[PDB]
Design a protein around this ligand. Structure first.
Ligand code: 9KG
Lengths: 547, 400
């Protein structure tokens, strides 16, 4: 017999202060008991389990469907935390094309990884005897049980340690581990590739691990986690938008799931309205009518999902490019590619929940997201193509009160272009009328007044019903914008209004703020000055609006 | 040569912080560094039974073309038991202070066995292909707060001859940095620094004297416009929260009427007297401003434009312990985030020199931008805490 190298065991403990599981065995039929006795007899003959005396006080229930299934949920609750087997799943666009890709079944190696000796006693289980007239058969696991908390992590780390020298001494190949399957790619000649595959089977056999000589059932195209992996391209598993006369909540969640999933390769996918219909429902079975905007959006989706689109694999020798387009209503779309017309992948970004916003902020956020995603997938930041002029970005970041930055980028003339819609002056405007504005409201009756007085004697006070102080201050500024020329100075005492306008929004939830924005866009020069209220600053007439 | 027992605070588990993604060059750099450290026994590979994790990344210090390994031990530090020297109040009063990196010394002292599993870190893989290379420390790690505390005895033994030789030199230790303050000449200071580094071998010019607190100043004009007087009244009204006797009614008396903003207004005599009394008040220090070692230090930074930044360190609102204006230009003329990051590093250094601890920052930047780019420009061995302000503060121009 050729000596088999032992696989080093991983020391496993229970959670601090907790004890091993002690669950009552499920009553089983006579046929199920016989099946489990046959299965457990074979497994004992193979070394996966061993019989134990009565000193073991722990027990885990067992079932059969034969096939033996052990319910380790209690032991899982009582087992220590392990390092995660995977922090995430790879993305196909990060893969690098290979001339040859082979799949090896290492399933026989799963039950061949030993379990920590001091921990085996916690895996004890009992087979009930016929009519329960004898003590049930007591077993314990000697290898990693299927369904136990630590089996995937210990298995992957053991396999990784086993594969480390082979991968080191063979840099011209690539080995990936996923569950009980290895995937070995190389650009070598097919003969050399199959040769090194045989070398890997031998190196794995030096630990007693058997890879089947049978041809593997898995063959291109590989279907994996909603993905199609072809020798030269990748895509999502086919997306079918169903034809439904009535759409319920689950139908819209499945539609937005298929659209979110399809958006990573199909460019132009929008999910704003269809997900908007799910706002604050919390009812899985409710039927919700479809808005017109959701109908147009769904039609554009069916037009985009008409014929299949594929993504290419990553080539590290070519530059990485990411191009962004604005779609409206806080929707943005992007394509990451290295060669024109051949995308690595695509995606979308929706603006965050906010009361006020502008296009430049959203574009910046989308850039940061694409940067993080690209560093995840490819390990580098892509060069960007953005629909914004260089001078626009320079004015924005030089004048913005916050610190901001986007990495290397170039302007692409693809409308709609992100632009600055208004810019406030830094100094008062000579020759322009000075509008001292103010507003006030009663907290009980919600009655208020908003108005202005100017240096030319122009005045206005308007009464308002169902309003607040902040609303009357904004309304005052709005009135001054309405009745002034193309150049105007405005004096307010509202730290609230100044805080809103200095954030430089181009769209808002409040219709009043949007009206102020529309007025600012029409102006040539606007200077917005602030003063403290109730300090006797003439012109600033608090008493004129508190009547 | 002998391990000291180290434990965690009661009821607290080890750190389990997600490793953030890294570029390929930083990953490769960490692979080389950690391979060498493993050859030197400073770290060892660990199995899946270790669930703890602490983030790691790679930087490049000043005047160097070699990568360096930076570990974000913030969580482990706050979860590590409190170890137990009064802060040198004379270090900030000294003419010059030099910062030395003594982190390598920590690697000569082994780490407590049972505690090593709490120093686990992960070199990540691109695109989640491999599980990531997992390590744990066998010696004192750089960045952990227990490393200077444990090495304090050995450091005293090494610095005992130099301390006995120069009683006029103040020596402070914070994390992996040694602050050496003196009053000599720049050449004599550099030769003395080479003397101390060759003294430590066989076993950053900083000038606090050119630093002071900044008073509130008011304009001096011969002609005032309505806008000038409005801004003056605004700034004085803001300063009245800090200074008690600030009076603005005689200056607001001039703003009576609805005049154009650019119209010149002559100051009455009462307004000149009020403004003069306000200048005299502002020339005095703030009443009842003390430091409390039990409270946190808060640092606020405002972007002034043209590479200028203002900052204030305080503990209670309107009770500033320090104020400053960082306007240095060092290869960041086109990058706001690099400027902000350097400013945070300098403010943190000053705070270390003055109080011996780092402040909590309020950064004028969106969370996603900062968290995306700040590691690209970080060069210090420590990391402070920070939060993000999303509303433009009105007081910005009052510090300009
Ligand atoms: C651990 C694996 C893993 O995480 N993932 C994402 C995977 C990578 C993977 O491919 C490669 C395995 C070796 C080296 C390079 C690979 O990719 C190069 C691109 N590629 C892809 C396909 C092709 O035919 N040709 C080609 O050139 C395959 C074939 C997988 C197949 C299944 C199935 N069922 C599941 C996951 C897989």
């Amino acid at each position: 017999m050729v000596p088999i190298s032992p696989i080093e065991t991983v020391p496993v403990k229970l959670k601090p202060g907790m004890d091993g599981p002690k669950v009552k065995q499920w009553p089983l039929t006579e046929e199920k008991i016989k099946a489990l006795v046959e299965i457990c007899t074979e497994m004992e003959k193979e070394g996966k389990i061993s019989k134990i005396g009565p000193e073991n006080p722990y027990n885990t229930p067992v079932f059969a469907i034969w096939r033996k299934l052990v319910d380790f949920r209690e032991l899982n609750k009582r087992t220590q935390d392990f390092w995660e087997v995977q922090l995430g799943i790879p993305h196909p666009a990060g893969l690098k094309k290979k001339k040859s890709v082979t799949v090896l079944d290492v399933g026989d190696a799963y039950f061949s990884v030993p379990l920590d000796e001091d921990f085996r006693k916690y895996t004890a289980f009992t087979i009930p005897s016929i009519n329960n007239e004898t003590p049930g058969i007591r077993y314990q696991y000697n290898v990693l049980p299927q369904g136990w908390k630590g089996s995937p992590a210990i298995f992957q780390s053991s396999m990784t340690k086993i594969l480390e020298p082979f991968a080191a001494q063979n840099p011209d190949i690539v080995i990936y581990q996923y569950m009980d399957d290895l995937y070995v790619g190389s650009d070598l000649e097919i003969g050399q590739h199959r040769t090194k595959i045989e070398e890997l089977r031998q190196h794995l056999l030096r630990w007693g691990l058997t890879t089947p000589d049978k041809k593997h059932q898995k063959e291109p195209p590989f279907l994996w986690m909603g993905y199609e992996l072809h020798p030269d391209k990748w895509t999502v598993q086919p997306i079918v938008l169903p034809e439904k006369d009535s759409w319920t909540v689950n139908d819209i969640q499945k539609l937005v799931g298929k659209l979110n999933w399809a958006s990573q390769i199909y460019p132009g996918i929008k999910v704003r309205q269809l997900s908007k219909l799910l706002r604050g429902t919390k009812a899985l079975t409710e039927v919700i009518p479809l808005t017109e905007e959701a109908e147009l959006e769904l039609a554009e989706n069916r037009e985009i999902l008409k014929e299949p689109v594929h993504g290419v694999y990553y080539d590290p020798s070519k530059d990485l490019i990411a191009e962004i387009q604005k779609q409206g209503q806080g929707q943005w779309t992007y394509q990451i590619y290295q060669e024109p017309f051949k995308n690595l992948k695509t995606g979308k970004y929706a603006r965050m929940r906010g009361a006020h916003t502008n296009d430049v902020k959203q574009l910046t956020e989308a850039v940061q997201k694409i940067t993080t995603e690209s560093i995840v997938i490819w390990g580098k930041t892509p060069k960007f193509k953005l629909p914004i002029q260089k001078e626009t970005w320079e004015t924005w970041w030089t004048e913005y009160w916050q610190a901001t930055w986007i990495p290397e980028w170039e302007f692409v003339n693809t409308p709609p272009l992100v632009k600055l819609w208004y810019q406030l002056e830094k100094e008062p405007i000579v020759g322009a009328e000075t509008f001292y504005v103010d507003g006030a409201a009663n907290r009980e009756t919600k009655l208020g007044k908003a108005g202005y007085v100017t240096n030319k004697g122009r005045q206005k006070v308007v009464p308002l019903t169902n309003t607040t102080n902040q609303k009357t201050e904004l309304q005052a500024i709005y009135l001054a914008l309405q009745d002034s020329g193309l150049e105007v100075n405005i004096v307010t005492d509202s730290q609230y209004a100044l805080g809103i306008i200095q954030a430089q929004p181009d769209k808002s939830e409040s219709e009043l703020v949007n009206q102020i924005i529309e007025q600012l866009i029409k102006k040539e020069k606007v200077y917005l000055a602030w003063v403290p209220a109730h300090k006797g600053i003439g012109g600033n007439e608090q008493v004129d609006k508190l009547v | 040569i002998e391990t000291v027992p180290v434990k965690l605070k009661p009821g607290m588990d080890g750190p389990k912080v997600k490793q953030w993604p890294l570029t390929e060059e930083k990953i490769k750099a960490l692979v080389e560094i950690c391979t060498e450290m493993e050859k030197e026994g400073k770290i060892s590979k660990i199995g899946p039974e270790n669930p703890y994790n602490t983030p790691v990344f790679a930087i490049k210090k000043k005047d160097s073309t070699k990568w360096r390994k930076l570990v974000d031990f913030r969580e482990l530090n706050k979860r590590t038991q409190d170890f137990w020297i009064p802060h040198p109040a004379g270090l900030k009063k000294k003419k010059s202070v030099t910062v030395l990196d003594v982190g390598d010394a920590y690697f000569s002292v082994p780490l407590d066995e049972d505690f090593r599993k709490y120093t686990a870190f992960t070199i990540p893989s691109i695109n989640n292909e491999t599980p990531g290379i997992r390590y744990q420390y066998n010696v004192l790690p750089q960045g952990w707060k227990g490393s200077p505390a444990i090495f304090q005895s050995s450091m005293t033994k090494i610095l005992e001859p130099f301390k006995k030789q120069n009683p006029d030199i103040v020596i402070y230790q914070y994390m992996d940095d040694l602050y050496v303050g003196s009053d000599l000449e720049i050449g004599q200071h550099r030769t003395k620094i080479e003397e101390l580094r060759q003294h430590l071998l066989r076993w950053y010019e900083l000038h606090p004297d050119k630093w002071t607190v900044q008073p509130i100043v008011l304009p001096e004009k011969d002609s005032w416009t309505v806008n000038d007087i409005q801004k003056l009244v605004g700034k004085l009204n803001w300063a009245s929260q800090i200074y008690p006797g600030i009076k603005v009614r005689q200056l607001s008396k001039l703003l009576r009427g609805t005049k154009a903003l650019t119209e010149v207004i002559p100051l009455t005599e009462e307004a000149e007297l009020e403004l003069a009394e306000n200048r005299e008040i502002l020339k005095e220090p703030v009443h009842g401003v003390y430091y409390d070692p039990s409270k946190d230090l808060i640092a606020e930074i405002q972007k002034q434009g043209q590479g200028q930044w203002t900052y204030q360190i305080y503990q209670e609102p309107f009770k500033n312990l320090k104020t400053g204006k960082y306007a240095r230009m060092r290869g960041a003329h086109t990058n706001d985030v690099k400027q902000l990051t350097e400013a945070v590093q300098k403010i943190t250094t000053e705070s270390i020199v003055i109080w011996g601890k780092t402040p909590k920052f309020k950064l004028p930047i969106q969370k996603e931008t900062w968290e995306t780019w700040w590691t690209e420009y970080w060069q210090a061995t420590w990391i402070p805490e920070w939060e993000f302000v999303n509303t433009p503060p009105l007081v910005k121009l009052w510090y300009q």
